[PDB]
Design a protein around this ligand. Structure first.
Ligand SMILES: C[C@@H](NC(=O)[C@H]1N(C(=O)[C@@H](O)[C@H](Cc2ccccc2)NC(=O)[C@@H](NC(=O)[C@@H](NC(=O)CN2CCOCC2)c2ccccc2)C(C)(C)C)CSC1(C)C)C(C)(C)C
Ligand SMILES: [Zn+2]
Lengths: 116, 116
């Protein structure tokens, strides 16, 4: 699907995320070319599973308290695609609660940016 | 152009930015579909130049202190299209010197994201 770019309407997609620690769940994800690494909400993980601490430099600035790192790979199924994206590791937003589909995933599903 | 997406490779582009308060300048800007608004470095702006305080949410959280907002429109010339993007207002990174082409800009040159 061509997703047109509009400052007022974020380019979002419904993606099904499998964290491998609880049941797969469909969340709203933001399609993000600025993002090196895909960001999953923590509500998709069980209480038990260990998560590595990590430091992240975003527009806000430095933060060690705010994102964690996955212990296991993550599987993302898009609405159209039958085969799952597999991400060796990705960031876990701990305090907020929506996902960012970053260039790690965008590469695996032959995603591109077109400028006429 | 079709811009392929690689996690190991920030999608950057050579942009010419006229802030209207100094000589126009060429910078390397990150093509970022998760940015609502364009960010450019304060290094393009003159010593006087009134800039409005602003609040901005990013990966590091909300930041009152880091970004300012332009008083005047910003002209952006890209390599291909001869005719410029005119942004009514865009963010100015004071702390670092980030260059990010957001959706405000990408819309004005009819950028789309294509997922096969
Ligand atoms: C390591 C990190 N990488 C990055 O963050 C890279 N960037 C990216 O990947 C960007 O796409 C980033 C994605 C993101 C949006 C909202 C929370 C957290 C991340 N976008 C922004 O940070 C941009 N922020 C924005 O566009 C924000 N807009 C506003 O702050 C203004 N309002 C709007 C509503 O909330 C109150 C303030 C925004 C608010 C809520 C949801 C989505 C956006 C911007 C400040 C750069 C203009 C910009 S800087 C970067 C390092 C190149 C990842 C966590 C994303 C992998
Ligand atoms: Zn914090």
């Amino acid at each position: 699907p061509v997703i047109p770019l509009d400052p007022a309407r974020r380019p979002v997609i419904k993606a099904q995320v499998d964290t491998q620690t609880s049941h797969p769940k469909t969340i709203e994800a933001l399609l993000d070319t600025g993002a090196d690494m895909t960001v999953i909400p923590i509500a998709l993980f069980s209480s038990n599973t260990p998560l590595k601490n990590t430091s992240v430099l975003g527009a806000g600035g430095q933060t060690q308290d705010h994102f964690k790192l996955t212990s296991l790979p993550v599987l993302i199924r898009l609405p159209f695609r039958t085969t799952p994206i597999v991400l060796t590791s990705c960031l876990v937003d701990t305090k907020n609660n929506w996902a960012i589909i970053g260039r790690d995933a965008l590469q695996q599903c032959q995603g591109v940016l077109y400028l006429p």
